Amino acid sequence: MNRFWNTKKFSLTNADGLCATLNEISQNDEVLVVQPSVLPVLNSLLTFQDLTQSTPVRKITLLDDQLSDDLPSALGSVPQMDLIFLIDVRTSLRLPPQLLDAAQKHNLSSLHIIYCRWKPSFQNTLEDTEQWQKDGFDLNSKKTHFPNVIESQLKELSNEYTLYPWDLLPFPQIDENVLLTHSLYNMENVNMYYPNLRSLQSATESILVDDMVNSLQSLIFETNSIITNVVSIGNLSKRCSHLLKKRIDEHQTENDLFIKGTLYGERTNCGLEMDLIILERNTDPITPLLTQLTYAGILDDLYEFNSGIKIKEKDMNFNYKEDKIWNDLKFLNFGSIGPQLNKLAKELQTQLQQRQAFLKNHTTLSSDVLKVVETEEYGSFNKILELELEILMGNTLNNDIEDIILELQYQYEVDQKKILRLICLLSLCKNSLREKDYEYLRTFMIDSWGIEKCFQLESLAELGFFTSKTSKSTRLQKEYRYISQWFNTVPATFAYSGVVPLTMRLVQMLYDRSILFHNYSSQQPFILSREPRVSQTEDLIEQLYGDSHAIEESIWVPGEDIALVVFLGGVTMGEIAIMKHLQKILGKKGINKRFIIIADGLINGTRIMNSIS
Amino acid sequence: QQYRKFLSEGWSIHTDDCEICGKKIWGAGLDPLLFLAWENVQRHQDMISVDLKTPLVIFKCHHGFHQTCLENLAQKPDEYSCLI
């Protein structure tokens, strides 16, 4: 807020707007009807008690076909004032049929709905006071617009179209530092980047990039920032950067270009820098599939977080704004939790009961997790780690891989997803697999897991995960054993099998070429540069991607620090753990910066496997 | 005529900063906080509230000084005199 990104301050605006709208609906007893996908987000913002006390609504429901049978049971009952639906139409451009069938059948006499949208900063605070009646109606907005958007398909029943545009802007839930935008799923639980229908990839990609650009524009115009340097990586990031630049340069108002002349300008500057490094998940498919070792990573891949940051099996919330025990243990390694918990418990003995309840709950949950790690296919949780560590450095032999893949297939029972992920990593690590092993691996797969597995192994065999030795979308076509020489991923590191992520070193090289100095270096343009630059580092990335055009460096202004590292394609939460380590080590070395990680939705190995199915 | 001609002319500043706290007020290299403070005013008039409440004082000596900086020397704000 006001050039200082007070992230928690973003939370209040959405709640205030929703409360004002709901209280301005009607001063009676209201019943709320909320879409299943958006409800968890709303509950993570407004508590039930606050919702009841602030506005006279007293009931919340869900959009389901069960309501059709309950139309004469639930909808017929209550209905003290009216029914206020809440829908999300930001993606999939289609209203759910539930409201369509309920409107005509139950014959509601008052239809009011709520639709979500990003904040229209271009409205610039209603533009003063309409310029004293538009200086004699010199400007007007009647019919100066298309008749309807998306909701033009709603042209049935009555004219009760009291729409209400509730505003929404990103706010942090999992942690103070990192915000999160939900644009990676539809209402049908289909991945927005890896859809299970290989006929409409291009449109889905365009829609995703458009929505991401819209969210970034909303945040940028809300915070009143001036981007100075852009480091785009990949193909889609190029289009995203160009579209964002065009949209910023088109829709910006006046009274700020004048400031753009005063600040920065010609022959002078004021020492303000913001960076917009952008990456794509397809660039490095090496590390969304490794096993998590941090506490929240282990707790995540065994029990999937929903849209809200909570879990079904437990009841206590993991929100950071009311508890401090979770703050200091979320990103620590699993091994260093026990003794720390023992010390925390023993120090309080000499020494309010809410802390006791919190520590008891944490101890019980940790004990349950430790118990469930073992005795549940004992040794698998470690065996996969040793196998992954062996594969990453490279120890594959002639036809011996077929012996170990089925070694744990039925000796220890294991899910399909683990095997599929491991074989994908095997096929991806060597950057190529010969033509004499697919004929056996695919045969065994189709033998053991049905007939539909052939379709999965065919569809997944074109995104780059499952390739054969015999508009490129920026795949990776270089052996990984080479990358272990330029970079020092395998020696400082946690949340993995002792391996540094590839994105980690990719962002490291932009500011300090130390590891690149040890290997493949005789001269460098610099050793410590404050501004992001890319020079004399083309050939290494020319062979790494097959084209010396993936790297893009853009300077916008002609002539401590906020860096916006967005993530198009999900964030593997282990990267968040190493981001803090990067910030700490860079601050120690001398360069002081602050990182904000924009995420389109948490991504994880198993969560990917159901996507392409 | 000489007295009349010497009551409308202005004066410039030749020094780059005061002589009691260093810093700089004229040449390129201002603190970004001042630039942000100017942006807060004359753009939206939201709220000008910050510790930067020191108005610069210009003198015939052209050296220039702050107000709180001179107040630190137990100088009443009615007898401001340059230190030469």
PDB file of all heavy atoms in Angstrom, chain A residues 2-4 224 226 255-256 258-259 262-263 268 270-272, chain B residues 28-33 35-36 38-40 42-44 46:
ATOM      1  N   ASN A   2       0.661   2.100  -1.010  1.00  0.00           N
ATOM      2  CA  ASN A   2       1.395   3.355  -1.171  1.00  0.00           C
ATOM      3  C   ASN A   2       2.902   3.100  -1.253  1.00  0.00           C
ATOM      4  O   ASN A   2       3.683   3.520  -0.397  1.00  0.00           O
ATOM      5  CB  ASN A   2       1.056   4.332  -0.043  1.00  0.00           C
ATOM      6  CG  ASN A   2      -0.216   5.112  -0.312  1.00  0.00           C
ATOM      7  OD1 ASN A   2      -0.400   5.667  -1.395  1.00  0.00           O
ATOM      8  ND2 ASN A   2      -1.104   5.154   0.675  1.00  0.00           N
ATOM      9  N   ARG A   3       3.286   2.363  -2.298  1.00  0.00           N
ATOM     10  CA  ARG A   3       4.678   2.071  -2.639  1.00  0.00           C
ATOM     11  C   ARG A   3       5.342   1.154  -1.617  1.00  0.00           C
ATOM     12  O   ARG A   3       6.497   0.752  -1.798  1.00  0.00           O
ATOM     13  CB  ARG A   3       5.481   3.366  -2.791  1.00  0.00           C
ATOM     14  CG  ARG A   3       4.935   4.313  -3.845  1.00  0.00           C
ATOM     15  CD  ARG A   3       5.490   3.993  -5.222  1.00  0.00           C
ATOM     16  NE  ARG A   3       6.849   3.467  -5.156  1.00  0.00           N
ATOM     17  CZ  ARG A   3       7.489   2.916  -6.178  1.00  0.00           C
ATOM     18  NH1 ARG A   3       6.922   2.804  -7.368  1.00  0.00           N
ATOM     19  NH2 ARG A   3       8.728   2.467  -6.001  1.00  0.00           N
ATOM     20  N   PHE A   4       4.623   0.810  -0.552  1.00  0.00           N
ATOM     21  CA  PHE A   4       5.080  -0.144   0.453  1.00  0.00           C
ATOM     22  C   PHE A   4       4.025  -1.238   0.542  1.00  0.00           C
ATOM     23  O   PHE A   4       2.946  -1.023   1.103  1.00  0.00           O
ATOM     24  CB  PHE A   4       5.301   0.534   1.804  1.00  0.00           C
ATOM     25  CG  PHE A   4       6.363   1.596   1.781  1.00  0.00           C
ATOM     26  CD1 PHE A   4       6.213   2.763   2.512  1.00  0.00           C
ATOM     27  CD2 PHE A   4       7.512   1.430   1.025  1.00  0.00           C
ATOM     28  CE1 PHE A   4       7.190   3.742   2.490  1.00  0.00           C
ATOM     29  CE2 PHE A   4       8.491   2.404   0.999  1.00  0.00           C
ATOM     30  CZ  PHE A   4       8.330   3.561   1.733  1.00  0.00           C
ATOM     31  N   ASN A 224       0.495   1.504  -7.578  1.00  0.00           N
ATOM     32  CA  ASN A 224       1.114   2.668  -8.216  1.00  0.00           C
ATOM     33  C   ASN A 224       2.631   2.483  -8.336  1.00  0.00           C
ATOM     34  O   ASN A 224       3.432   3.205  -7.743  1.00  0.00           O
ATOM     35  CB  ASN A 224       0.776   3.957  -7.456  1.00  0.00           C
ATOM     36  CG  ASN A 224      -0.686   4.039  -7.071  1.00  0.00           C
ATOM     37  OD1 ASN A 224      -1.565   4.086  -7.931  1.00  0.00           O
ATOM     38  ND2 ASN A 224      -0.955   4.064  -5.771  1.00  0.00           N
ATOM     39  N   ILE A 226       6.097   1.557 -11.016  1.00  0.00           N
ATOM     40  CA  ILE A 226       6.647   1.826 -12.340  1.00  0.00           C
ATOM     41  C   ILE A 226       7.730   0.801 -12.651  1.00  0.00           C
ATOM     42  O   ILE A 226       8.867   0.919 -12.180  1.00  0.00           O
ATOM     43  CB  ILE A 226       7.206   3.257 -12.442  1.00  0.00           C
ATOM     44  CG1 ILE A 226       6.173   4.282 -11.969  1.00  0.00           C
ATOM     45  CG2 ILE A 226       7.647   3.555 -13.869  1.00  0.00           C
ATOM     46  CD1 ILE A 226       6.453   4.843 -10.592  1.00  0.00           C
ATOM     47  N   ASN A 255      -2.154  12.637 -15.582  1.00  0.00           N
ATOM     48  CA  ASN A 255      -1.712  13.065 -14.256  1.00  0.00           C
ATOM     49  C   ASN A 255      -0.705  12.090 -13.655  1.00  0.00           C
ATOM     50  O   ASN A 255      -0.312  12.231 -12.493  1.00  0.00           O
ATOM     51  CB  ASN A 255      -2.910  13.249 -13.320  1.00  0.00           C
ATOM     52  CG  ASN A 255      -2.596  14.142 -12.136  1.00  0.00           C
ATOM     53  OD1 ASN A 255      -1.563  14.812 -12.106  1.00  0.00           O
ATOM     54  ND2 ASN A 255      -3.487  14.158 -11.153  1.00  0.00           N
ATOM     55  N   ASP A 256      -0.280  11.100 -14.434  1.00  0.00           N
ATOM     56  CA  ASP A 256       0.775  10.174 -14.040  1.00  0.00           C
ATOM     57  C   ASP A 256       1.918  10.130 -15.039  1.00  0.00           C
ATOM     58  O   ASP A 256       3.069   9.934 -14.643  1.00  0.00           O
ATOM     59  CB  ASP A 256       0.201   8.761 -13.835  1.00  0.00           C
ATOM     60  CG  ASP A 256      -0.225   8.105 -15.135  1.00  0.00           C
ATOM     61  OD1 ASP A 256      -0.440   8.827 -16.130  1.00  0.00           O
ATOM     62  OD2 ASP A 256      -0.346   6.863 -15.160  1.00  0.00           O
ATOM     63  N   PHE A 258       2.770  12.799 -16.466  1.00  0.00           N
ATOM     64  CA  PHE A 258       3.462  13.976 -15.952  1.00  0.00           C
ATOM     65  C   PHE A 258       4.408  13.595 -14.821  1.00  0.00           C
ATOM     66  O   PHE A 258       5.546  14.073 -14.765  1.00  0.00           O
ATOM     67  CB  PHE A 258       2.445  15.014 -15.480  1.00  0.00           C
ATOM     68  CG  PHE A 258       3.034  16.369 -15.216  1.00  0.00           C
ATOM     69  CD1 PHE A 258       3.716  17.050 -16.209  1.00  0.00           C
ATOM     70  CD2 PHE A 258       2.902  16.964 -13.972  1.00  0.00           C
ATOM     71  CE1 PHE A 258       4.258  18.298 -15.966  1.00  0.00           C
ATOM     72  CE2 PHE A 258       3.441  18.211 -13.723  1.00  0.00           C
ATOM     73  CZ  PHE A 258       4.119  18.880 -14.722  1.00  0.00           C
ATOM     74  N   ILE A 259       3.955  12.728 -13.914  1.00  0.00           N
ATOM     75  CA  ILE A 259       4.837  12.212 -12.873  1.00  0.00           C
ATOM     76  C   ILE A 259       5.928  11.345 -13.486  1.00  0.00           C
ATOM     77  O   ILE A 259       7.071  11.334 -13.011  1.00  0.00           O
ATOM     78  CB  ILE A 259       4.026  11.441 -11.816  1.00  0.00           C
ATOM     79  CG1 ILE A 259       2.771  12.224 -11.427  1.00  0.00           C
ATOM     80  CG2 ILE A 259       4.879  11.158 -10.590  1.00  0.00           C
ATOM     81  CD1 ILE A 259       3.058  13.594 -10.854  1.00  0.00           C
ATOM     82  N   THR A 262       8.578  13.820 -14.384  1.00  0.00           N
ATOM     83  CA  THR A 262       9.284  14.328 -13.212  1.00  0.00           C
ATOM     84  C   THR A 262      10.181  13.252 -12.614  1.00  0.00           C
ATOM     85  O   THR A 262      11.408  13.389 -12.582  1.00  0.00           O
ATOM     86  CB  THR A 262       8.279  14.823 -12.173  1.00  0.00           C
ATOM     87  OG1 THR A 262       7.507  13.715 -11.695  1.00  0.00           O
ATOM     88  CG2 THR A 262       7.338  15.832 -12.796  1.00  0.00           C
ATOM     89  N   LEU A 263       9.575  12.171 -12.127  1.00  0.00           N
ATOM     90  CA  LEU A 263      10.342  11.009 -11.709  1.00  0.00           C
ATOM     91  C   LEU A 263      11.001  10.369 -12.925  1.00  0.00           C
ATOM     92  O   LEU A 263      10.476  10.425 -14.039  1.00  0.00           O
ATOM     93  CB  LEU A 263       9.435  10.000 -11.002  1.00  0.00           C
ATOM     94  CG  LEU A 263      10.094   8.869 -10.211  1.00  0.00           C
ATOM     95  CD1 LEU A 263      10.474   9.345  -8.818  1.00  0.00           C
ATOM     96  CD2 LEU A 263       9.176   7.659 -10.135  1.00  0.00           C
ATOM     97  N   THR A 268      18.399  12.105 -15.610  1.00  0.00           N
ATOM     98  CA  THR A 268      18.314  12.011 -14.159  1.00  0.00           C
ATOM     99  C   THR A 268      17.498  10.785 -13.775  1.00  0.00           C
ATOM    100  O   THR A 268      16.751  10.229 -14.583  1.00  0.00           O
ATOM    101  CB  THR A 268      17.700  13.276 -13.545  1.00  0.00           C
ATOM    102  OG1 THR A 268      17.747  13.188 -12.115  1.00  0.00           O
ATOM    103  CG2 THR A 268      16.257  13.446 -13.994  1.00  0.00           C
ATOM    104  N   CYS A 270      15.986   8.646  -9.820  1.00  0.00           N
ATOM    105  CA  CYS A 270      15.760   8.760  -8.384  1.00  0.00           C
ATOM    106  C   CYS A 270      16.037   7.456  -7.643  1.00  0.00           C
ATOM    107  O   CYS A 270      15.634   7.308  -6.485  1.00  0.00           O
ATOM    108  CB  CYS A 270      14.334   9.239  -8.112  1.00  0.00           C
ATOM    109  SG  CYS A 270      13.783  10.550  -9.228  1.00  0.00           S
ATOM    110  N   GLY A 271      16.721   6.512  -8.282  1.00  0.00           N
ATOM    111  CA  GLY A 271      17.139   5.294  -7.604  1.00  0.00           C
ATOM    112  C   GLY A 271      16.012   4.407  -7.119  1.00  0.00           C
ATOM    113  O   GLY A 271      16.069   3.894  -5.995  1.00  0.00           O
ATOM    114  N   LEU A 272      14.984   4.214  -7.942  1.00  0.00           N
ATOM    115  CA  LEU A 272      13.890   3.301  -7.638  1.00  0.00           C
ATOM    116  C   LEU A 272      13.861   2.205  -8.692  1.00  0.00           C
ATOM    117  O   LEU A 272      13.834   2.497  -9.892  1.00  0.00           O
ATOM    118  CB  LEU A 272      12.549   4.038  -7.591  1.00  0.00           C
ATOM    119  CG  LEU A 272      12.500   5.290  -6.713  1.00  0.00           C
ATOM    120  CD1 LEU A 272      11.193   6.041  -6.918  1.00  0.00           C
ATOM    121  CD2 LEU A 272      12.688   4.925  -5.249  1.00  0.00           C
TER     122      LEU A 272
ATOM    123  N   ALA B  28      21.824  16.458  -8.081  1.00  0.00           N
ATOM    124  CA  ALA B  28      21.260  15.127  -8.253  1.00  0.00           C
ATOM    125  C   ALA B  28      21.800  14.176  -7.193  1.00  0.00           C
ATOM    126  O   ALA B  28      23.002  14.148  -6.914  1.00  0.00           O
ATOM    127  CB  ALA B  28      21.572  14.592  -9.649  1.00  0.00           C
ATOM    128  N   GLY B  29      20.903  13.389  -6.606  1.00  0.00           N
ATOM    129  CA  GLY B  29      21.280  12.493  -5.531  1.00  0.00           C
ATOM    130  C   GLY B  29      20.422  12.647  -4.292  1.00  0.00           C
ATOM    131  O   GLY B  29      20.829  12.248  -3.198  1.00  0.00           O
ATOM    132  N   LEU B  30      19.234  13.227  -4.450  1.00  0.00           N
ATOM    133  CA  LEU B  30      18.320  13.381  -3.328  1.00  0.00           C
ATOM    134  C   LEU B  30      17.886  12.020  -2.793  1.00  0.00           C
ATOM    135  O   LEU B  30      17.889  11.009  -3.501  1.00  0.00           O
ATOM    136  CB  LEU B  30      17.081  14.184  -3.733  1.00  0.00           C
ATOM    137  CG  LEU B  30      17.110  15.716  -3.726  1.00  0.00           C
ATOM    138  CD1 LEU B  30      17.329  16.243  -2.314  1.00  0.00           C
ATOM    139  CD2 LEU B  30      18.144  16.276  -4.683  1.00  0.00           C
ATOM    140  N   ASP B  31      17.516  12.006  -1.518  1.00  0.00           N
ATOM    141  CA  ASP B  31      16.969  10.801  -0.918  1.00  0.00           C
ATOM    142  C   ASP B  31      15.645  10.453  -1.591  1.00  0.00           C
ATOM    143  O   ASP B  31      14.811  11.346  -1.804  1.00  0.00           O
ATOM    144  CB  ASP B  31      16.764  11.000   0.584  1.00  0.00           C
ATOM    145  CG  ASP B  31      16.964   9.722   1.375  1.00  0.00           C
ATOM    146  OD1 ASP B  31      17.771   8.873   0.943  1.00  0.00           O
ATOM    147  OD2 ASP B  31      16.313   9.569   2.430  1.00  0.00           O
ATOM    148  N   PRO B  32      15.414   9.189  -1.947  1.00  0.00           N
ATOM    149  CA  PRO B  32      14.144   8.831  -2.600  1.00  0.00           C
ATOM    150  C   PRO B  32      12.923   9.098  -1.740  1.00  0.00           C
ATOM    151  O   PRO B  32      11.813   9.195  -2.279  1.00  0.00           O
ATOM    152  CB  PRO B  32      14.306   7.332  -2.890  1.00  0.00           C
ATOM    153  CG  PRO B  32      15.783   7.093  -2.872  1.00  0.00           C
ATOM    154  CD  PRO B  32      16.333   8.043  -1.855  1.00  0.00           C
ATOM    155  N   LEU B  33      13.091   9.213  -0.420  1.00  0.00           N
ATOM    156  CA  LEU B  33      11.957   9.507   0.449  1.00  0.00           C
ATOM    157  C   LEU B  33      11.350  10.866   0.123  1.00  0.00           C
ATOM    158  O   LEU B  33      10.126  11.021   0.128  1.00  0.00           O
ATOM    159  CB  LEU B  33      12.381   9.447   1.917  1.00  0.00           C
ATOM    160  CG  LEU B  33      12.363   8.082   2.614  1.00  0.00           C
ATOM    161  CD1 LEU B  33      10.945   7.530   2.670  1.00  0.00           C
ATOM    162  CD2 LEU B  33      13.311   7.085   1.958  1.00  0.00           C
ATOM    163  N   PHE B  35      11.427  12.354  -2.830  1.00  0.00           N
ATOM    164  CA  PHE B  35      10.739  12.210  -4.109  1.00  0.00           C
ATOM    165  C   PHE B  35       9.391  11.523  -3.931  1.00  0.00           C
ATOM    166  O   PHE B  35       8.402  11.904  -4.569  1.00  0.00           O
ATOM    167  CB  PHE B  35      11.614  11.432  -5.090  1.00  0.00           C
ATOM    168  CG  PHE B  35      12.463  12.305  -5.967  1.00  0.00           C
ATOM    169  CD1 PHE B  35      13.837  12.145  -6.004  1.00  0.00           C
ATOM    170  CD2 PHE B  35      11.886  13.287  -6.754  1.00  0.00           C
ATOM    171  CE1 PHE B  35      14.621  12.948  -6.810  1.00  0.00           C
ATOM    172  CE2 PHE B  35      12.664  14.093  -7.562  1.00  0.00           C
ATOM    173  CZ  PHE B  35      14.034  13.923  -7.590  1.00  0.00           C
ATOM    174  N   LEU B  36       9.333  10.501  -3.075  1.00  0.00           N
ATOM    175  CA  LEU B  36       8.058   9.858  -2.778  1.00  0.00           C
ATOM    176  C   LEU B  36       7.112  10.806  -2.052  1.00  0.00           C
ATOM    177  O   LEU B  36       5.901  10.779  -2.295  1.00  0.00           O
ATOM    178  CB  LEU B  36       8.292   8.590  -1.955  1.00  0.00           C
ATOM    179  CG  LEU B  36       7.122   7.627  -1.735  1.00  0.00           C
ATOM    180  CD1 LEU B  36       7.638   6.203  -1.619  1.00  0.00           C
ATOM    181  CD2 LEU B  36       6.318   7.992  -0.494  1.00  0.00           C
ATOM    182  N   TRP B  38       6.946  14.071  -2.361  1.00  0.00           N
ATOM    183  CA  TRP B  38       6.375  14.986  -3.344  1.00  0.00           C
ATOM    184  C   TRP B  38       5.294  14.296  -4.166  1.00  0.00           C
ATOM    185  O   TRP B  38       4.309  14.927  -4.567  1.00  0.00           O
ATOM    186  CB  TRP B  38       7.462  15.539  -4.264  1.00  0.00           C
ATOM    187  CG  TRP B  38       6.892  16.289  -5.428  1.00  0.00           C
ATOM    188  CD1 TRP B  38       6.407  17.565  -5.418  1.00  0.00           C
ATOM    189  CD2 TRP B  38       6.708  15.802  -6.763  1.00  0.00           C
ATOM    190  NE1 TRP B  38       5.952  17.909  -6.666  1.00  0.00           N
ATOM    191  CE2 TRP B  38       6.123  16.844  -7.510  1.00  0.00           C
ATOM    192  CE3 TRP B  38       6.988  14.591  -7.400  1.00  0.00           C
ATOM    193  CZ2 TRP B  38       5.815  16.710  -8.860  1.00  0.00           C
ATOM    194  CZ3 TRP B  38       6.680  14.462  -8.742  1.00  0.00           C
ATOM    195  CH2 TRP B  38       6.100  15.514  -9.457  1.00  0.00           C
ATOM    196  N   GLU B  39       5.467  13.000  -4.436  1.00  0.00           N
ATOM    197  CA  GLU B  39       4.468  12.261  -5.201  1.00  0.00           C
ATOM    198  C   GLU B  39       3.158  12.141  -4.432  1.00  0.00           C
ATOM    199  O   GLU B  39       2.078  12.125  -5.032  1.00  0.00           O
ATOM    200  CB  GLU B  39       5.007  10.878  -5.567  1.00  0.00           C
ATOM    201  CG  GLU B  39       4.386  10.280  -6.818  1.00  0.00           C
ATOM    202  CD  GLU B  39       4.898   8.884  -7.114  1.00  0.00           C
ATOM    203  OE1 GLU B  39       5.187   8.138  -6.153  1.00  0.00           O
ATOM    204  OE2 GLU B  39       5.014   8.531  -8.306  1.00  0.00           O
ATOM    205  N   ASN B  40       3.234  12.042  -3.102  1.00  0.00           N
ATOM    206  CA  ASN B  40       2.025  11.925  -2.293  1.00  0.00           C
ATOM    207  C   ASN B  40       1.148  13.164  -2.436  1.00  0.00           C
ATOM    208  O   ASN B  40      -0.075  13.062  -2.587  1.00  0.00           O
ATOM    209  CB  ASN B  40       2.399  11.689  -0.830  1.00  0.00           C
ATOM    210  CG  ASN B  40       1.222  11.229   0.013  1.00  0.00           C
ATOM    211  OD1 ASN B  40       0.082  11.197  -0.452  1.00  0.00           O
ATOM    212  ND2 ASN B  40       1.497  10.867   1.259  1.00  0.00           N
ATOM    213  N   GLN B  42       0.026  16.784  -4.459  1.00  0.00           N
ATOM    214  CA  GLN B  42      -0.193  17.287  -5.818  1.00  0.00           C
ATOM    215  C   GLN B  42      -0.616  16.200  -6.801  1.00  0.00           C
ATOM    216  O   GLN B  42      -0.775  16.480  -7.996  1.00  0.00           O
ATOM    217  CB  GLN B  42       1.023  18.064  -6.369  1.00  0.00           C
ATOM    218  CG  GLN B  42       2.306  17.281  -6.640  1.00  0.00           C
ATOM    219  CD  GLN B  42       2.322  16.613  -8.001  1.00  0.00           C
ATOM    220  OE1 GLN B  42       1.740  17.116  -8.962  1.00  0.00           O
ATOM    221  NE2 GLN B  42       2.982  15.464  -8.085  1.00  0.00           N
ATOM    222  N   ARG B  43      -0.819  14.971  -6.335  1.00  0.00           N
ATOM    223  CA  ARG B  43      -1.302  13.880  -7.171  1.00  0.00           C
ATOM    224  C   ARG B  43      -2.682  13.399  -6.752  1.00  0.00           C
ATOM    225  O   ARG B  43      -3.599  13.348  -7.578  1.00  0.00           O
ATOM    226  CB  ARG B  43      -0.307  12.712  -7.138  1.00  0.00           C
ATOM    227  CG  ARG B  43      -0.614  11.610  -8.134  1.00  0.00           C
ATOM    228  CD  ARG B  43       0.053  10.304  -7.735  1.00  0.00           C
ATOM    229  NE  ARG B  43      -0.309   9.216  -8.635  1.00  0.00           N
ATOM    230  CZ  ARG B  43      -0.446   7.951  -8.263  1.00  0.00           C
ATOM    231  NH1 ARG B  43      -0.261   7.575  -7.009  1.00  0.00           N
ATOM    232  NH2 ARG B  43      -0.780   7.041  -9.173  1.00  0.00           N
ATOM    233  N   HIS B  44      -2.854  13.046  -5.479  1.00  0.00           N
ATOM    234  CA  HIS B  44      -4.159  12.661  -4.957  1.00  0.00           C
ATOM    235  C   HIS B  44      -4.500  13.308  -3.624  1.00  0.00           C
ATOM    236  O   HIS B  44      -5.663  13.235  -3.216  1.00  0.00           O
ATOM    237  CB  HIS B  44      -4.248  11.136  -4.804  1.00  0.00           C
ATOM    238  CG  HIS B  44      -4.168  10.392  -6.100  1.00  0.00           C
ATOM    239  ND1 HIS B  44      -5.215  10.334  -6.993  1.00  0.00           N
ATOM    240  CD2 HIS B  44      -3.162   9.671  -6.652  1.00  0.00           C
ATOM    241  CE1 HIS B  44      -4.861   9.611  -8.040  1.00  0.00           C
ATOM    242  NE2 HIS B  44      -3.619   9.197  -7.858  1.00  0.00           N
ATOM    243  N   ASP B  46      -3.901  12.335  -0.704  1.00  0.00           N
ATOM    244  CA  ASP B  46      -4.396  11.297   0.191  1.00  0.00           C
ATOM    245  C   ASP B  46      -4.050  11.609   1.642  1.00  0.00           C
ATOM    246  O   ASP B  46      -4.943  11.865   2.456  1.00  0.00           O
ATOM    247  CB  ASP B  46      -3.823   9.935  -0.210  1.00  0.00           C
ATOM    248  CG  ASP B  46      -4.190   9.543  -1.629  1.00  0.00           C
ATOM    249  OD1 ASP B  46      -5.346   9.779  -2.038  1.00  0.00           O
ATOM    250  OD2 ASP B  46      -3.319   8.993  -2.336  1.00  0.00           O
TER     251      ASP B  46
END
